[PDB]
Amino acid sequence: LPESFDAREQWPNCPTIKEIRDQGSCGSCWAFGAVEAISDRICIHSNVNVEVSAEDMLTCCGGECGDGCNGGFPSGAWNFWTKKGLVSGGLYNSHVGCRPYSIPPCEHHVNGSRPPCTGEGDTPKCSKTCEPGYSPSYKEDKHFGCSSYSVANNEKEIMAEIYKNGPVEGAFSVYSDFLLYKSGVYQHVSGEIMGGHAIRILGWGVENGTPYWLVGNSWNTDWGDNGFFKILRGQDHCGIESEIVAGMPCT
Numbered sequence: 441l442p443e444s445f446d447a448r449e450q451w452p453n454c455p456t457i458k459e460i461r462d463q464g465s466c467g468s469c470w471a472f473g474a475v476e477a478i479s480d481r482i483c484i485h486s487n488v489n490v491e492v493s494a495e496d497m498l499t500c501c502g503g504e505c506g507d508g509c510n511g512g513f514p515s516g517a518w519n520f521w522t523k524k525g526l527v528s529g530g531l532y533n534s535h536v537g538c539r540p541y542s543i544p545p546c547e548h549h550v551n552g553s554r555p556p557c558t559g560e561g562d563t564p565k566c567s568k569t570c571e572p573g574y575s576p577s578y579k580e581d582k583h584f585g586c587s588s589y590s591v592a593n594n595e596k597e598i599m600a601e602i603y604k605n606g607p608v609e610g611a612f613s614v615y616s617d618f619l620l621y622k623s624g625v626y627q628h629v630s631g632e633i634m635g636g637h638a639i640r641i642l643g644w645g646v647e648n649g650t651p652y653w654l655v656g657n658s659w660n661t662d663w664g665d666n667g668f669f670k671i672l673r674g675q676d677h678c679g680i681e682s683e684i685v686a687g688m689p690c691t
């Protein structure tokens with residue numbers, strides 16, 4: 441395996457890999473990390489490009505994935521993809537796809553032109569219909585996964601999985617010092633625990649001798665490093681290597 445790897449550069453024909461979304465005022469990171477990686481993999485293993493709907497995952501999976509905007513289970517999200525499939529759907533107010541995201545973007549721990557995010561956000565309804573004007577039908581727009589699995593808490597195995605099959609979804613414990621991340625390789629040193637947070641891991645590298653994972657957060661582009669961040673790799677830091685999940689699209 442190479443010393444560094446960036447899925448964005450390795451798969452130039454898959455622009456979703458470079459995208460950063462905004463989960464809004466809703467604890468749906470479990471859903472976002474999943475649909476983002478799934479969007480990437482559908483493109484990687486079908487070279488079609490599809491903006492997988494975070495809305496469909498968030499609202500229709502149900503208990504199998506947890507509790508909507510109250511948090512969820514990543515592995516459950518990939519299961520939904522293989523069992524019920526996912527329709528397309530872009531960003532809030534984009535009118536792209538069957539079910540675009542319905543929760544407005546906001547400012548996540550940073551100042552900006554958008555309204556500040558609020559902790560309170562209710563899970564939207566599971567509506568099995570597409571926006572007006574979009575074709576085909578909700579049912580016909582479903583994209584299915586043909587496998588859902590968990591990658592071991594093993595650095596090399598995780599790197600090999602990304603290297604071969606594309607970005608994966610992971611999760612780690614967020615402490616307050618992470619909220620102000622701007623650059624460099626994040627290492628937890630202080631702050632009250634905020635809770636678990638699911639994200640998309642799309643690569644790795646070494647910065648100033650410190651090994652790291654290249655990660656895409658779902659707090660828009662004005663947070664962190666253009667929406668991305670790097671976190672210590674190889675020490676299961678904050679549990680970053682303890683909950684890796686992925687899957688393969690049906691062919």
Ligand SMILES: *[C@]1(C(=O)N[C@H](C(=O)N[C@H](C(=O)O)[C@@H](C)CC)[C@@H](C)CC)O[C@@H]1C(=O)OCC
Pocket residue numbers: 463464465466467468469470510511512513514548549557558559560561611614634635636637638659
């Ligand atoms: C993952 C999650 O969504 N994380 C939360 C989060 O992202 N919070 C947002 C923030 O700006 O910090 C706000 C705007 C949304 C309400 C919290 C916990 C992290 C700081 O509860 C989700 C989950 O399913 O986690 C289990 C992996």
